[PDB]
Amino acid sequence: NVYLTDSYLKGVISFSECNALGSYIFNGPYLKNDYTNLISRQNPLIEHMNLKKLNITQSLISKYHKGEIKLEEPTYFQSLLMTYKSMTSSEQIATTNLLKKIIRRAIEISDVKVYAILNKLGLKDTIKTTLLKKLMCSMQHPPSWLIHWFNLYTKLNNILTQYRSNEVKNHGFTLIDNQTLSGFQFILNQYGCIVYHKELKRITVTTYNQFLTWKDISLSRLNVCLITWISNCLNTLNKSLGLRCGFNNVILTQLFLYGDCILKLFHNEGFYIIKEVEGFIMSLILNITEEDQFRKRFYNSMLNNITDAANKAQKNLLSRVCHTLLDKTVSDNIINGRWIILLSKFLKLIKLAGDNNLNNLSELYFLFRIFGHPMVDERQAMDAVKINCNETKFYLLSSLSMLRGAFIYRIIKGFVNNYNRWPTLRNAIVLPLRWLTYYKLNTYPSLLELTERDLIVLSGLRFYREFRLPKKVDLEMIINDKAISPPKNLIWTSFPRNYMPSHIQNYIEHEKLKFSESDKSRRVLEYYLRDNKFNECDLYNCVVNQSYLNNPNHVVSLTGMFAMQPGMFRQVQILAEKMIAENILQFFPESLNNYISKCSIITDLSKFNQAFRYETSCICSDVLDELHGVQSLFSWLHLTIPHVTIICTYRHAPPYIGDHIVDLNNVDEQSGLYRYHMGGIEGWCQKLWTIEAISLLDLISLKGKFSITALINGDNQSIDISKPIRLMEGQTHAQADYLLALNSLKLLYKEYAGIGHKLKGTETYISRDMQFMSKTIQHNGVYYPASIKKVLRVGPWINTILDDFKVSLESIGSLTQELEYRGESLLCSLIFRNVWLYNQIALQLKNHALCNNKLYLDILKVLKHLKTFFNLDNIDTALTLYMNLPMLFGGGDPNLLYRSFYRRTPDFLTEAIVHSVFILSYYTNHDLKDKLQDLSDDRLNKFLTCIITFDKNPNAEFVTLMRDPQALGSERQAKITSEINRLAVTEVLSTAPNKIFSKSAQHYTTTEIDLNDIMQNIEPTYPHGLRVVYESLPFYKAEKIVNLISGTKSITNILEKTSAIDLTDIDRATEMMRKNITLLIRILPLDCEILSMENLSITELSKYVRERSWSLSNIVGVTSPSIMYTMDIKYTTSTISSGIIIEKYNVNSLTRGERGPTKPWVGSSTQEKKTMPVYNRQVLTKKQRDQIDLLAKLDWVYASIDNKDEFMEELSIGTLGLTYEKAKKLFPQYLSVNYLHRLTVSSRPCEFPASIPAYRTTNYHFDTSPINRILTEKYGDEDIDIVFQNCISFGLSLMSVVEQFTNVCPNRIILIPKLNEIHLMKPPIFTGDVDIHKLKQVIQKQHMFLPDKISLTQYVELF
């Protein structure tokens, strides 16, 4: 039962926590004169008392109360730290040598993959490559700023690691240290951080999250400098190798220093100014991509925004520090307005960082993150929201009618386009004469034939129930690892018992005895697991009866803004949303002389929640309720929120509760608590508001006589406007476009004001033609990525639970792959990933929190084993080789070589084996441009022999293949986290008070055995068909819930109401990690007839390994050759007319950052052909349609089953509730013959893109005529196992890679396949029977997760 703290900022830095702690320590207002300090000094916390009562804390307080030391805000010390240059000669030497060693090791590790790639492409000490020899010669001496950032990160990380280890060992540990960081004195604790600087006589009291943020800032700046230095060295070596952006380290260091100075002069509020940096950057971009009028307007609005933000920050800080203990801390440069100098210089630096280049100005978006996160105040933020959410809005009845009519018109248009029918109106008499003709003929007028009169007429239509409300609640949508607000009467339980008065505590203790345990849960998963009165149709009964209206328990809780509501009001909040996601977004597909003039308007929609009132949202949500037949399900918000008491329920931000006040509705309104919130809460009903915005844009297009195109990507929308105009004499295109933009701006401002959304000029801006959706920059068909922004947080234990090793390596590889896929640099991403992998494995492994050096001892065992096995020179070479072995066998390299040439593959084992072959060619001196043969060095022979010869221990083959159709078995693969914890999760869930979960957990093992026994008799095992069988049974839902639960920390304490990790889970995870680490010594025993490479096909070898592992006679449909091995690469004229030809249509030698003529290569997966039978498809819910599709897929793939009739009768009677012949009328009829490459399940890649940005694919043209003719001659119109899309993607990506490594893009490449690697694939006849009794048992045991049955009336209405 230990406590493990975070290593990265996984939450928010708290203003209230810092205020309370610093106000208790120093006995006076610290950051703000709110109620937090009053209650934190009147009634302190135990953790705060423990922090204050230390000897060093008492010494510091005694120093301050005299006072020799001065109190400062956390940002002062952030600025002080990030410039700490007080490094002695010994420390300088130590850090320089450590960084040199890390760089050398990473380059040595990367040399293996570079040699493999260069040997495959034929582009011809511990470094055998001349390229990386030169790179190391360049990289011998690190720069001073990089050493500074690395040293600072190392020291902060050492502090964090020491505290985390000694807190896992000893509970309540407080780390006091003044030696690691010279000058500073840290008192660090999971609930505080007191920093004292002696030489400057300064002191602050901040939180643990702020220390995590400082560590993250140091890591981010270290990563930026690492990437910049690597890229600059590569570019100096070759202008194509590194990233496209060319940066300057000195300038960037100056940017960090000046941003910290800004954050120091201004206090916390200084982040406001930083918040505007993108504005400047955006303006800079426009100065290359825009004309005079647009760019000048944007520049002026940018300057106005920046300076208004600065003035607001100054006013706020001066009004905030008025009566605190920081009143003397305000700089004299804030009072006299001298900051306007410093800020200017900062902006100048950004321009110097841009260097009038789109690449640098696009990459420069990391500046928001390297300066840390603001100490967010909660009371002030939600008061600012209240200001805009209590305002009365005045509406013109004509405007409301027009909006509702546009919504109804879009609904009708979607129905007619999709269902080829008008929704059945219940008062169709309204349609006067012509709309009646449109209704009877089932046609709709085009937008250009539409008038405002027509929309006002349409605004009067009422429909009949046209959609289905699911009776049985889906448990995959209402279950998550997120907190839940307590009920209203129990809301006081969100604040510490010390902070609440005596009467509140007595009331809480007397009310916890009146609420069921599920209510007092504080977490969603605990809310449902502890619900002993759960019903499958409680949600439907709530919606139908409208039990969420006028409910005394409704409350809204604002935390880090993230709002939540108690229990059932949450599930309704999802249910309504869910319905809009299925039944209504299909109608709104965009929610995911004689001169044509075009403009674009980008609007920040993150303020819709405040603007929308009932009178605007209801006019469309009522149409949605009418379509679904419910009364007020999509309008619940505005009929429920007004009557509730919105409260900020942060732990350290309690309200001032009056004398004898126990009810939240009678609490006096104040900062941190308000009522009568007329409007929407951000996040809830987001889909409805997006739909409403699209309807408004259609109405504006009608009112403006221009064609329109909307793209609403979440909280920001782009509107593309086109109008045909009679061009004036002398007028140019730019003036016409600008005039159109201004007129459309005025019109949409008028309309948005018409619905009471007073648009602000700071949010909306206009551009001629550039679109900046998906947070990416696109100029004339060229993509400029902010790749560096995503690889900032690449540290050792990133995105993991219990500091897992395999998962952290997976995350490191995935993150550092963005410098490859987006940034377009193989070598830069490779070296960055190797730097951080070496840091995680060689250095940070022996500093684990829970198993301090158990993993390092195991990794040393593995290295000794690999030295003995492969006959390596020493353990350095053993680590280098381990780092380049696939995680399927070993665990070093998380990114296989195929990922450098195409994203998706359908056979991981073959790619892993080919990667191993290529890697071991580094040591065996094997040529990769020739065939496989037996030579003197038999390291590869021994590896392959140990791969194929192993003792087979099959167990539960069929359930494992249903769960992971790519699984190996016989304990030949590394077990995953969900596999290990599945048994523990079931043992935890079996005792849950909820009968639905306990019953399904009690039968879990027996149902698994039965599920293994269903399809054991079919001889030619198809794992993907087994997956189809899996998803069509109710065990899939139970498995998904169990897998979701198994991903959390501290499974055992899930029902124990603790945040501590049980020792059982700690030990289990430790053993899992050790077994996974030693899997490499288990896979390759020292004493393992030798496989002969003469006429060896790795496809057959992988097929044999997969079959032998499960000891199955035949496994089909999961083995596909590796494209990177199959296709030899030629760069000269094809004298034999064989192989795919990829040619460069661009005329420039370098094709990076240039768009060509050809169409983009999306990957283009070929889908299946099916004749959908005609019936009223809207009568079936989404679950029923998915089940019907799955059963039809089974009927297509299992048409050869000897007892198909009984098997499908049982399946349809059990799941769908219909007989086989009744359900067969609804099954899609798959015209395609071959199901082994046209089946579509989640286990198959839906797309096969290249490892390059889409635009880049336009530079090249692919021709696959000769290989197609040869393959159709050899196989005669029969599907083979090699993926065509992956062949094309491999060709394109290797053209890009040869350009990178050669500096000259190839004129033409030819991919000549290896014929023996390609094998025919026909759909086989599935001889054998299906165990009907076992299938019935599987259906019955987990019947509680069965999808909705198709009732007799539903089938009748279905036709």
């Binding site: 509406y395 009845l397 004509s398 409301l400 009618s401 509702r404 009519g405 309204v430 349609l431 006067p432 004469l433 709309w435 009169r453 006002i456 007429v457 349409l458 605004s459 009067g460 009422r462 009949y464 129930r465 409300l469 919606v543 139908v544 009866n545 209206l549 006028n550 009932y614 009178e615 209801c618 006019i619 009522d622 309720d625 009418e626 037949g629 419910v630 009364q631 007020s632 505005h638 009929l639 429920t640 007004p642 009557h643 007329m678």
Partner: protein, 57 residues
Amino acid sequence: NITARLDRIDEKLSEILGMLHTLVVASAGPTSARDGIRDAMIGLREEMIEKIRTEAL
């Protein structure tokens, strides 16, 4: 032109119906829901009617 006048009158009546319906929808606000009279302006729909019919057995 009598039919033309009748058609114009019918279209104006249709506009009146649309405006009055939108006013009815927008006037059935949270005050009505607190009152419990929203279903008077909105009307019983398929779900509630089916639930009552099941209860009426």
